[PDB]
Amino acid sequence: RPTVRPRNDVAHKQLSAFGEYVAEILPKYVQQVQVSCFNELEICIHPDGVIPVLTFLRDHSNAQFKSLADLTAVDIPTRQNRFEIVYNLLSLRFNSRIRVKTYTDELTPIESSVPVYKAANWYEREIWDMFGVFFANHPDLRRILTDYGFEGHPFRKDFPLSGYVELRYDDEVKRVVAEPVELAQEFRKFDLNSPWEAFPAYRQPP
């Protein structure tokens, strides 16, 4: 069918088997394993298992996920643990990708994964800067993207898009000053969602 993305059952079956494989080996930490309809394997773990699970995936001979492609966070305010921490790993030996997810809140620290992957150093600094998740035993945790002295964590869902302060040059003090934000044109919020359901397959129980 020309316009529909073709399925791949061979990869789906392979990833499902490896997902069980990981769950059997690390039952202490694995909470959920799922494979999406486009064949991406997700391992959901308890946050205590960050270092053990990542080390196993990097070092086990049947895994060898030697490359940390990316590490990021997602803010979901409705959850008790609002922050979802996502690790995307790449295995060159087996030409495969895997995603490891865990969770934390504003006050619970996550173990830094710099010991497993040196790539994590700057990724975890960015998560701290943008979401305010603290990483324990980080070699040098501090802001990386925001301005010095910047207050708040911009990528949180409850942080306003335009922030709280704006900069200008003030001639009286002969320097750049910060002041509360006023906008000549307010950003116009749009209500775009259709009141009609689009995808029955994802309907939630009422």
Binding site: V4, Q32, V35, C37, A201
Partner: protein, 94 residues
């Protein structure tokens, strides 16, 4: 393209290349800036029958993830081991 024979020879010799055959300035070989109108083709869904949307609706064939394990035998790898690359036969070495 208007260079003299001597100047063409001089710069060819200095560069060691036949510069005149591959000038980096474009002349008349480019395509005309006025072209005849196109008549583009239509896609496979441009049919008058046997074409119901429910039979070609990609978005509605998406499914939630398959849960293989929830908290509420031979060893396997995520995929078969990658196959060794073959050295180029066009030009294996620079």
């Amino acid at each position: 393209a208007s260079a003299t024979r001597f100047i063409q020879w001089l710069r060819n010799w200095a560069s060691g290349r036949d510069l005149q055959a591959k000038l980096q300035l474009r002349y008349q070989e480019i395509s005309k800036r006025t072209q005849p109108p196109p008549k583009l083709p239509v896609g496979p869904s441009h049919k008058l029958s046997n074409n119901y949307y429910c039979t070609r609706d990609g978005r509605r064939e998406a499914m939630p993830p398959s849960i293989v394990m929830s908290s509420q035998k031979k060893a396997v790898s995520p995929a078969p081991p990658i196959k060794r690359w073959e050295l180029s036969q066009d030009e294996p070495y620079l």
